[PDB]
Design a protein around this motif. Structure first.
Motif, PDB file in Angstrom:
ATOM      1  N   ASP A   1       0.805  -1.213   0.000  1.00 17.47           N
ATOM      2  CA  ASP A   1       0.000   0.000   0.000  1.00 17.47           C
ATOM      3  C   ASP A   1       0.846   1.275   0.000  1.00 17.47           C
TER       4      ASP A   1
ATOM      5  N   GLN B   1      -8.549   2.520  -3.589  1.00 19.37           N
ATOM      6  CA  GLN B   1      -8.549   1.105  -3.237  1.00 19.37           C
ATOM      7  C   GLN B   1      -9.882   0.660  -2.633  1.00 19.37           C
TER       8      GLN B   1
ATOM      9  N   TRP C   1     -10.260  -5.666  -6.188  1.00 20.04           N
ATOM     10  CA  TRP C   1      -9.118  -5.809  -5.286  1.00 20.04           C
ATOM     11  C   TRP C   1      -9.358  -7.000  -4.366  1.00 20.04           C
TER      12      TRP C   1
END
Ligand SMILES: Cc1cc2nc3c(=O)[nH]c(=O)nc-3n(C[C@H](O)[C@H](O)[C@H](O)COP(=O)(O)OP(=O)(O)OC[C@H]3O[C@@H](n4cnc5c(N)ncnc54)[C@H](O)[C@@H]3O)c2cc1C
Length: 295
Positions: free
Chosen positions: A263, A281, A290
């Motif tokens: 991340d 995200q 994701w």
């Protein structure tokens, strides 16, 4: 469409071990085994990215029956022999420290599985999971970020995409997108399915990229051992550029700990174009693009 819980713990499918083969080559760390089970005589069906449960024999230290452990399915829906008759697992033997009383501690279900003989009956449950499913869209891009036994769902995707016998068996799925596996293990002997992964990259150079992070053999730019987060940082702009596509899916699998550094890498990339990665995200997760399975 998705098969789920065709067998449950209270009445599991009793399958038989067909084979149990080593995946860690000489000079590697630990034991990881590829285990194939016979499904004939039952109706256990499954698709790529799902898991099954295994119920090991015996009782725990409190005298209570051992319960199931989940393992990511390592074969496509058709099985390794593309005959719709089997299912395979990729199992590492858990072993560890002295601050858990004794000496080396060996995990119950994983030791049972890694040492199991062909011909043995096994209690199987499932399949389970709807969070690691591959898109039916043959033009989708697929990013795969795996460590150790997290290679398992990735194997089911790549075999479906790239094996000749899979392509012949799946008229509806003739993959033409781009997939990229970043795979982190400690040594080259520990590269699970190395030969077949590299064969796929050689046959399909435009549709498959393979990147390793090998901690005992490579150093990152700071002088530390190379891990998967280091490779994602190195390729952060490339990965973000792919992730921007409406048709791109990302999959993360392995023992917990990988996500934080991944991340941070993608956050620095996205920030250059005025995007907050954490928010982008969240929307990707909501869209089903994701996918994460860590343990
Ligand atoms: C969805 C999912 C998919 C999975 N897929 C796979 C797969 O494909 N392959 C695979 O090998 N495993 C997989 N796992 C993990 C697997 O389910 C079992 O947890 C693992 O095999 C260990 O089970 P065991 O019975 O061997 O250990 P147990 O005997 O159940 O021992 C586990 C306990 O030991 C401890 N522990 C774990 N690691 C350490 C350590 N190094 N240091 C200290 N203590 C520790 C904790 O107390 C843990 O609860 C998956 C898990 C999930 C949830």
């Amino acid at each position: 469409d998705v098969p789920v819980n065709l067998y449950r713990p209270n009445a599991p499918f009793i399958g038989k071990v067909i084979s149990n083969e080593p995946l860690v080559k000489e000079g590697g760390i630990g034991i990881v085994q590829h285990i194939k089970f016979d499904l004939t005589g039952g109706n256990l069906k499954y698709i790529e990215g799902q898991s099954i449960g295994i119920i090991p024999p015996g009782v725990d230290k409190n005298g209570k029956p051992e319960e199931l452990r989940l393992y990511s399915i390592a074969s496509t829906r058709h099985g390794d022999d593309v005959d719709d008759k089997t299912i395979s697992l990729c199992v590492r033997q858990l072993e560890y420290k002295h601050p858990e009383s004794g000496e080396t501690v060996y995990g119950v279900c994983s030791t049972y599985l890694t040492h199991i003989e062909p011909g043995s009956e096994v209690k199987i449950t499932g399949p389970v999971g709807k969070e690691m499913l591959l898109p039916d869209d043959p033009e989708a891009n697929v990013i795969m970020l795996a460590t150790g036994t997290g290679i398992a769902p990735m194997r089911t995707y790549l075999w479906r995409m790239f094996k000749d016998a899979e392509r012949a068996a799946n008229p509806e799925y003739q993959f033409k997108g781009f997939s990229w596996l970043v795979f982190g293990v400690p040594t080259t002997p520990n590269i699970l399915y190395k030969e077949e992964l590299e064969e796929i990259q050689q046959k399909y150079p435009d549709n498959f990229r393979l990147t390793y992070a090998i901690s005992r053999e490579q150093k990152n730019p700071q002088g530390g051992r190379m891990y998967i987060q280091d490779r994602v940082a190195e390729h952060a702009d490339q990965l973000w550029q792919l992730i921007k596509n409406q048709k791109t899916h990302t999959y993360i699998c392995g023992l917990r700990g990988m996500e934080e550094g991944i991340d941070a890498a993608l956050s620095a990339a996205a920030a250059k174009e005025g995007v907050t990665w954490s928010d982008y995200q969240k929307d990707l997760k909501k869209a089903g693009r994701w996918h994460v399975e860590t343990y």
